[PDB]
Amino acid sequence: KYLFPKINETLLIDIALGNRFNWLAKEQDFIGQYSEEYVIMDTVPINMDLS
Amino acid sequence: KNEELMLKRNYPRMATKLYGNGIVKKQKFTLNNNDTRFNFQTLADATNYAL
């Protein structure tokens, strides 16, 4: 009735976690506020009415 | 039928179709040296724009 209670094991159950999107890993230099890009509008060909 | 039918001729008959001309079609573009450089703040992207 007089002993201190004897502890013997802690473990810290721990697992890491994932992304499922890490093949989109694109790095940069972090410069500039805005970024943009562009594309061309189509120009269909024409009837050569050479008159 | 009478024997002189051997002298009577019979040409093979024809089934034709005429087509004629096609279309010359053209398509042009007009790239600039000043007004596109008001936009396109990097020169290499202007060359990429060009091709």
| Angle at B45 (CA atoms; ends B41, B49), nearest 5 degrees | 120
- Contact A48/B23 with Cβ under 8 angstroms? yes
How far is residue B46 CA from its own chain's centroid? 32
Q: Which two tokens stand for residue B31?
A: 């790239």
- Beta strand spans in chain B (E): 25-26
Sign of CA dihedral B41, B44, B45, B50: positive
CB atoms A48 and B24 under 8 Å:
yes
CB atoms A46 and B25 under 8 Å:
yes
Largest CA distance in chain B: 96
Nearest to B48 by CA among A33, A39, A45, A1: A39
Contact residues, chain B, for A45 at CB < 8 Å: 25-27
Q: How was this structure determined?
A: cryo-EM
- Contact B26/A45 with Cβ under 8 angstroms? yes
Contact residues, chain A, for B26 at CB < 8 Å: 45-46, 48
Q: Give resolution, Å, one decimal.
A: 3.8
Q: What is the C-alpha to C-alpha distance for residues A42 and A28, in angstroms, rounded to an integer? A: 32
| Angle at B25 (CA atoms; ends B20, B30), nearest 5 degrees | 165
- Contact B40/B46 with Cβ under 8 angstroms? yes
Contact residues, chain A, for B23 at CB < 8 Å: 47-48
Nearest to B36 by CA among A38, A31, A32: A38
State the DSSP code for B51: -
CB atoms A46 and B24 under 8 Å:
no
How many CB atoms neighbour CB B21 within 10 A?
A: 5
